[PDB]
Amino acid sequence: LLGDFFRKSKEKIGKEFKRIVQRIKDFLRNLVPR
Amino acid sequence: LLGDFFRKSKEKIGKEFKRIVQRIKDFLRNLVP
Ligand SMILES: CCCCCCCCCCCCOP(=O)([O-])OCC[N+](C)(C)C
Ligand SMILES: CCCCCCCCCCCCOP(=O)([O-])OCC[N+](C)(C)C
């Protein structure tokens, strides 16, 4: 998303975002189980 | 962004973003003094 620059920063951001998303998903599957 | 949840994660994202932006600004200032 910035060519080859800011690899470690882009990784960190990516990880934190994936975790917010994953945690929200878990909350939703507690809220509305199948 | 998400109320009071994910305080640490949002702080992390914000910081890394501010650092990317700072480096971009530095490069641009060197490119065009
Ligand atoms: C078009 C205007 C925007 C240009 C973006 C600024 C690019 C200049 C960044 C220069 C310093 C920050 O490099 P970085 O991310 O620590 O690199 C990681 C290691 N490499 C340098 C080998 C890739
Ligand atoms: C519809 C989508 C809603 C998603 C909301 C899911 C929230 C998930 C909560 C877990 C994520 C982290 O929060 P926490 O470390 O427990 O907060 C600690 C600080 N307070 C208690 C004051 C807030």
Numbering used by the authors:
A (entry chain A): 1 to 34
B (entry chain B): 1 to 33
Question: What wording appears in the published article?
Answer:
LL-37 is an extensively studied peptide with particular relevance in human innate immunity. The active peptide carries a surplus of positive charge, which is attributed to interactions with the LPS or LTA of the bacterial cell wall, and negatively charged lipids of in vivo cytoplasmic membranes. We determined its atomic structure in solution and the putative membrane interaction states.
We obtained two co-crystal structures, both of which are dimeric with anti-parallel helix orientations, containing two DPC (LL-37DPC-2) or six LDAO molecules (LL-37LDAO-2), respectively. However, the structural deviation to LL-372 is significant (2.2 Å for 57 aligned Cα atoms) and only the core region can be reasonably aligned. NMR data using DPC micelles confirmed the detergent induced structural changes at the N-terminus of LL-37DPC-2 with a random coil rather than an α-helical structure. When we analyzed the crystallographic environment of LL-37LDAO-2 and LL-37DPC-2 (LL-37LDAO-2 with one monomer in the AU; LL-37DPC-2 with two monomers in the AU), we noticed a ‘head-to-tail’ arrangement between the peptide dimers forming tetramers and the higher fiber-like structure oligomers. These fiber-like structures were observed in both lattice types (LL-37LDAO-2 and LL-37DPC-2) although the crystallographic environment does not correspond to each other. The ‘head-to-tail’ interfaces are formed primarily by the hydrophobic residues Phe5, Phe6 and Phe27, all of which are strongly conserved within the family of cathelicidins. When we analyzed the crystallographic packing of LL-37LDAO-2 and LL-37DPC-2 in this context it turned out that one-dimensional chains are formed by hydrophobic head-to-tail interactions in both crystal forms.
